[PDB]
Amino acid sequence: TCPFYKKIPGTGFTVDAFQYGVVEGCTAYFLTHFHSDHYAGLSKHFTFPVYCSEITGNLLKNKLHVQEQYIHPLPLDTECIVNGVKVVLLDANHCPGAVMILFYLPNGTVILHTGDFRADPSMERSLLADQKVHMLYLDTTYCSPEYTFPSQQEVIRFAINTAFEAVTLNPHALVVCGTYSIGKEKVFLAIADVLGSKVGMSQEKYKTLQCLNIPEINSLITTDMCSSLVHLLPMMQINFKGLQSHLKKCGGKYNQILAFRPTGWTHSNKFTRIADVIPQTKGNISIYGIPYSEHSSYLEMKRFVQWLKPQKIIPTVNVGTWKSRSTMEKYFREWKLEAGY
Ligand code: NI
């Protein structure tokens, strides 16, 4: 059944709740972003109102074929009324089109649902600064102190410097980048920019990127693989067998592959700096796992919550085990006692 952490009290609303059939009492279904664990269940047969960003609504129309009449896109940073309730969508610093949602309940309670987010100090100057938030529905993906990772900027600097050096030493090297969802487009776009290439990809993935309102996108991507020396492949193909096979397909244009897997966290983060990352190599193929995150680190999450000072926190991630739920509740109490709210 629909879990309680997907329901907004005092409303008929649900968030990211499309796989339970008709949720009894739901008048509006919000979708925070276009990732499959969140949209699971939507299709051309859905006939209830879906509220979302403009970019998420482009993907629902073009990739899932949801009918236009049920897609209700809202502008960001704008007070809107939905079924009698004031709401605001805020940028979540996750993937393209991802939002956080502020609900202003008729009784005076204010609720923030973060969706999936990577907390940032810039959020402390949005419309969130303007009133008190009583309840926080929080993306707790990396809510443990072992989860450190570098800034997105540091990781892209590493990637650009590594690719540029490799291709300048060997003009016959191909760069490959893995993907299995939207998000992390900076990785492949920044590498193609330094190399003076467009990124080549499948027709399905090009269609997906043409929904994202990225500026000058027609100048950066292509379905012509032959004209490109940065290829995007399914994350599943980023291994020695898959990459050897791909290299055969390129008809002797290339004699070396340098590949990137933009993982979330990996336990080499506890020991190793970004400066010191090394690849796995077999023959003329090298694979780099780079810690490019679109979720909060522990410290980023802690700073946001100690700034916001909510009265009640409802985790939305890692809620399936008692040991995880108890650990998270212990951190929330520490943060509150340290900061004095
Ligand atoms: Ni997500």
Q: Give, in degrees to the nearest 5, the angle at Cα 264 between 261 and 266.
A: 90
CATH number at residue 208: 3.40.50.12650
Are residues 10 and 132 located together in one domain of the fold?
yes
Report the alpha-carbon distance of residue 195 to residue 188 in Å, rounded.
11
Q: If you measure from the C-alpha of residue 145 to the centroid of ligand 1, how many angstroms do you get, rounded to a whole number?
A: 21
Q: If you measure from the C-alpha of residue 178 to the centroid of ligand 1, how many angstroms do you get, rounded to a whole number?
A: 17
Are residues 11 and 125 located together in one domain of the fold?
yes
CATH number at residue 29: 3.60.15.10
140-168 as b/e, with b when 16 or more CB fall inside 10 Å?
A: bbbbeeebebbebeebbebbbebbeebbe
Number of domains in the chain: 2
CB-based contacts of 335, cutoff 8 Å, min separation 6: 302, 305, 306
Angle between helical axes of 298-308 and 322-339 (0-180°, round to 10): 50
Token output for 301: 């999450």
Could you count the other beta carbons within 10 Å of the beta carbon of residue 87?
Answer: 22
Q: Are 74 and 36 in contact (CB under 8 A)?
A: no
Are residues 288 and 160 located together in one domain of the fold?
yes
Given CA atoms 231, 232, 238, 243 in this order, what sign does their dihedral have?
negative
Q: Are 185 and 97 in contact (CB under 8 A)?
A: no
Are residues 126 and 152 located together in one domain of the fold?
no
Report the alpha-carbon distance of residue 174 to residue 257 in Å, rounded.
5
Q: If you measure from the C-alpha of residue 41 to the centroid of ligand 1, how many angstroms do you get, rounded to a whole number?
A: 16
Report the alpha-carbon distance of residue 283 to residue 61 in Å, rounded.
44
**Three-class SS of residue 85?**
strand
Are residues 191 and 273 located together in one domain of the fold?
yes
CB-based contacts of 213, cutoff 8 Å, min separation 6: 54, 55, 58, 96
Are residues 55 and 197 located together in one domain of the fold?
no
Report the alpha-carbon distance of residue 192 to residue 217 in Å, rounded.
12
Are residues 20 and 162 located together in one domain of the fold?
no
Q: If you measure from the C-alpha of residue 316 to the centroid of ligand 1, how many angstroms do you get, rounded to a whole number?
A: 12
Are residues 290 and 325 located together in one domain of the fold?
no
Q: How was this structure determined?
A: X-ray
Give bridge partners of residue 91 from the DSSP assignment.
99
Reference 301, options 288, 290, 310, 292; nearest CA is: 310
Given CA atoms 60, 61, 63, 66 in this order, what sign does their dihedral have?
positive
CB-based contacts of 20, cutoff 8 Å, min separation 6: 1, 2, 41
Q: Are 275 and 165 in contact (CB under 8 A)?
A: no
Q: If you measure from the C-alpha of residue 244 to the centroid of ligand 1, how many angstroms do you get, rounded to a whole number?
A: 31
Resolution in A: 1.5
Show the domain range for 183.
Answer: 148-295
Are residues 212 and 276 located together in one domain of the fold?
yes
Phi-psi region of 27 (alpha: psi -120 to 50; beta: other; left: phi over 0): alpha
Q: Are strands 85-91 and 99-104 parallel, antiparallel or unpaired?
A: antiparallel
Q: If you measure from the C-alpha of residue 282 to the centroid of ligand 1, how many angstroms do you get, rounded to a whole number?
A: 32
User: Residue 107: what are its φ and ψ, rounded to 5°?
Assistant: -75, -5
